[PDB]
Amino acid sequence: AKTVTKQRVESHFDLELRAAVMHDILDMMPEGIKQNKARTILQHLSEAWRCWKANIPWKVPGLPTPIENMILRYVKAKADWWTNTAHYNRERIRRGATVDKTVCKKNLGRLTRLYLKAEQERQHNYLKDGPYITAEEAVAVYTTTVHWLESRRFSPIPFPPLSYKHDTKLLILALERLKEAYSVKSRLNQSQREELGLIEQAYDNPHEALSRIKRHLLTQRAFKEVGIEFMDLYSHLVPVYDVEPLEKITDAYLDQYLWYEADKRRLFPPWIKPADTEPPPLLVYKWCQGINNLQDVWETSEGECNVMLESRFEKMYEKIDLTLLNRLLRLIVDHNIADYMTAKNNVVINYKDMNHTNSYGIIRGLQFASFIVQYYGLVMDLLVLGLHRASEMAGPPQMPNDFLSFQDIATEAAHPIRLFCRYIDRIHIFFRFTADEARDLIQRYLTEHPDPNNENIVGYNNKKCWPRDARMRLMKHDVNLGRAVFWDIKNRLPRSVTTV
Amino acid sequence: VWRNTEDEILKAAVMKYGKNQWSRIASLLHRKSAKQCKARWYEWLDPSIKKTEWSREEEEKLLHLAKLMPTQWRTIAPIIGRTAAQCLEHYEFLLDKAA
Amino acid sequence: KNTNAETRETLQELYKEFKGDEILAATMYSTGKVSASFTSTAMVPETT
């Protein structure tokens, strides 16, 4: 009579689940007089569980209702147990209680299945509840992008020519980037051996390659399927996408090409900032040193207020929309390349045995997805700043500005938004208000979201890492300005595009 | 690529083993892997994929969608019942016949 | 939305020339919708 300890917990749960079933109906709601096929109702029950886990709609065509209700009830019992165990262990792992090495792997597998069930549902809901972005928001976004590009005098990016001069440089860079994955040359596998073979043969004959590439880019719009899996960082997981080596090469090249041309034609204005000119410790220096050089920035004499707000765009890679994104890419590139990119984001995504089809967001594991994310983020910089201030920051197209510079002091001081940097999808804005700008902002804030009960002070979150001598001090005017500024910035962004 | 002999060895293997044991079927094949096996079956050798001519309503629906949801062939295809490569070739083919 | 002439004239011509749709208009024991929608998130949940 041995206890149930830690290694017999799952085995024991199933002994008792399937005992309970056999008690429950297959011998207390029979009237299948013969020999009640309990051995087969149990087989349904185990296949109902496999189908729940794989997200397959399990329906056995003719099967009496009492039996179907019994099976559905017990699969839901097992699913509640399985999911609550996943929650529990993920907290333990996140804070640090287990070092057990089979729990780490069981739990990564459990949360991968749960993520893919949530995701297939979210794609179905797209195709059912329809494009979430209206036909008024989509048109405002399109027209505003056209006005930007036309005032910049952009010059759209053309199809990689036939006798282009740089293509072997661009392809050599592609392939160097790809070999960096297999730097160590481990036991890799069949599939990595085959990818290395492709890289070497296209390293030897660089024109069979470029012929193949430009053929793909010209004719293909239905691609293979990509596999997914997660990288566990103990505090959250990261998706990791696995694309087929042929298309990996065509995308590596397209990546390099688009970035070279975009930067030569000056597509991305200077506030889009993982830029090649400095490392992140240098951006922090330049931001501090840009604030400090604003004009009369530290004076409070007449009652000004500086506000530094910084947030995140909160789901851009996942409510990108492939039709609006196709058209917005077409404003910029050759309709062939726009179509290749947009049709390459719509593939079948596959984990152990679950498959679904991407239709709504973006696969971030493609190689041009840097380009797509930064272009979309440019469009949303425009919705946040407006075309007038964004054109004052980016300066006249014949004479651009540098990171946080303006042309004169009149233009710099002609507006509250003095600095703006957008790391990939992180947003840091710096406002400088006069006394009456601040008073009117707070007026229109309170008018809509009235706080008579002084509860604005409660939600405010500061940094409990400096001493209270150095934290933020929540006076009424201060926390109300903070909230008004946030309320005013979060209103510029439709909720079907991104939010804050 | 693929040759009559291998295609038929595949057919036989699958029809015996079942349509989710890709690794053993791969093992039967010399120089073929389970990715390729699975792809080949689900696009060309599955018998629910139909190689016939397009009904006129199939085609008018085809063009309607390819205008609604441009370049999303994996999303379009199941809404009319051919694979996305078929849908794609036939859409360019209608576009060019009317070219 | 009074943003520009492109948007004003767009919505004019859209609410003018745009009329209802056809293909996707049409295309949007027991039976088994319960079991289906329960072991599949990619369906609308029936509970009966």
């Binding site: 349904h44 179905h124 059912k128 494009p131 036909a135 989509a138 | - | 859209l14 745009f18 949007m28």
Partner: peptide, 23 residues
């Protein structure tokens, strides 16, 4: 009581979106 042995929707605002964009 005999037991057998175990072994798309599209909204219509897609259209009004796409054509509003073409216009």
């Amino acid at each position: 009581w005999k037991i057998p042995p175990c072994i798309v929707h599209i909204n219509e605002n897609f259209a009004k979106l796409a054509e509003a964009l073409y216009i």
